[PDB]
Amino acid sequence: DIVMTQSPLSLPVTPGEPASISCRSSQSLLYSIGYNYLDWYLQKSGQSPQLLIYLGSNRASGVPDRFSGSGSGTDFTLKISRVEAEDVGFYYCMQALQTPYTFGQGTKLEIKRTVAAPSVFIFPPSDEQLKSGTASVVCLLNNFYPREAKVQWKVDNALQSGNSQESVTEQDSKDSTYSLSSTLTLSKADYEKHKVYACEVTQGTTSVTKSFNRG
Amino acid sequence: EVQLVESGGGLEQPGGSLRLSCAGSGFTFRDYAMTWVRQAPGKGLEWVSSISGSGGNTYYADSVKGRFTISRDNSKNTLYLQMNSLRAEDTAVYYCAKDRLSITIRPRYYGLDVWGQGTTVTVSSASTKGPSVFPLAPESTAALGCLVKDYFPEPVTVSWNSGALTSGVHTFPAVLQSSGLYSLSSVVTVPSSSLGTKTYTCNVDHKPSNTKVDKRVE
């Protein structure tokens, strides 16, 4: 099977700057003069892949002028002349010379931007949920940059460990920010025992705390 | 426009079987090779199988040979994948894609030019479970959301106001809980002045359990 490899795997870029993603094949993809069987695909968060380039250099229907493919044989490059915020996503090369068709590992295009502090919101468990014997407390960090942020849960000022999970959106296509939600899971019994619920969000040496009183 | 619409994804036991379907419109289906590509959770793309326009030839990844069988019904413009002897490695989103023109003496390649929306296959020994949907109730900006808790398998989709509300929506990646069930939250930020006037409803779909719930967030 033809092995496809990409460089880099992560590509931080400032909007307006060029980007280059490279693909190497273990075998020549030149079927005959003018015909290299190499494609490029984009996959945005929560979307299906979409064709960008086929046969090395042909630009697919509706793909912006800004995208181009070049190369021959075993070496190929996808170029973006000027990166736009909405270009965030994974880029894959694929060979179509032989079955099995084989893909590169994927390159994540990341957009560089200025720092942004999150808007932080805390949500007590719903009355509906509390009927069931479980309590979920949710902390939302909205529209921040960079991705690195520490969330600490405090219950009656006791630091929680091991009872929270978080997940993060991919970069917003317009503003290049992240959002994050963290969920504290307590038994209803434990929830009803305590009063003060706090989510503390730290970037660098700055901490913002949002809290509610159960009572 | 050219569209591929997939169905048939869901949960099966290891060793079990499932059939996927991919219905095409907007092109002369019988003229084109058709292809299945999958993506395991948090992994890249992997080619699975292809079939020529006429069904003259079929092609498979080594790891699926024999166990998987590709087919097509040209009269129904539909591509199928029969997936037998299912293994953990088969857990993935499966995409169908339109492949080369195969009717011509020499096949003509246009890339994988059209892709389906995907269907999720989960191979696990557990049971299907539908979610509970809990409100996340309420600066000039307010945040509200819905917590979609305790479902299996993936995935859940969420929209707001039947798809009308698009700006400021954040639907988070599902988290696998220690219980082996998933939870997902979806939030939106809205003008606080609007909370009295306009309603906000999250539209949750979990196809595996035939759960389709709309929750008004007061």
Residue numbers in the entry:
A (entry chain B): 1 to 215
B (entry chain A): 1 to 138, 145 to 224
Authors' description from the paper:
By engineering a small secondary structural element from the rabbit light chain constant domain into the human kappa light chain, we dramatically improved the crystallization of human Fabs and Fab:antigen complexes. Alignment of a human Fab structure onto a rabbit Fab showed that the longer FG loop present in human Kappa constant domains forms a bent and bulging conformation that would interfere with a beta sheet packing interaction. In the case of the FG loop, this consisted in replacing the septamer human sequence HQGLSSP (positions 198 to 204 according to Kabat numbering) between the structurally homologous T and V (position 197 and 205 respectively, according to Kabat numbering), with the pentamer rabbit sequence QGTTS (positions 199 to 203 according to Kabat numbering). The resulting mutant is shorter by two residues, with deletions of histidine at position 198 and proline at position 205, and is referred to here as ΔQGTTSΔ (positions 198 to 204 according to Kabat numbering).
Separately to the crystal packing analysis we have observed that the C-terminal interchain disulfide is rarely ordered in Fab structures (in only 20% of the Fab structures in our internal database). This could be due to conformational heterogeneity or to heterogeneous oxidation. Neither the K126A mutation nor any of the disulfide variants (not shown) produced significantly more conditions with crystals. Nor did the disulfide removal (C127A + GEP*) or the conversation of the interchain disulfide to an intra-heavy chain disulfide between Cys127 and Y229C (ESKC + GEP*, Kabat numbering) appear to impact crystal packing or diffraction. Structures were obtained with the intrachain disulfide ordered. The temperature factors in this region were higher than average as is seen in other structures with the interchain disulfide ordered. All structures derived from Fabs with the ΔQGTTSΔ FG loop on the other hand packed forming a beta sheet between the G strand of the kappa constant domain and the G strand of the constant heavy 1 (CH1) domain. At the time this suggested to us that the K126A mutation and disulfide removal might have an advantage, but subsequent results with dupilumab Fab indicated that the simplest ΔQGTTSΔ version was as good as the more complicated versions.
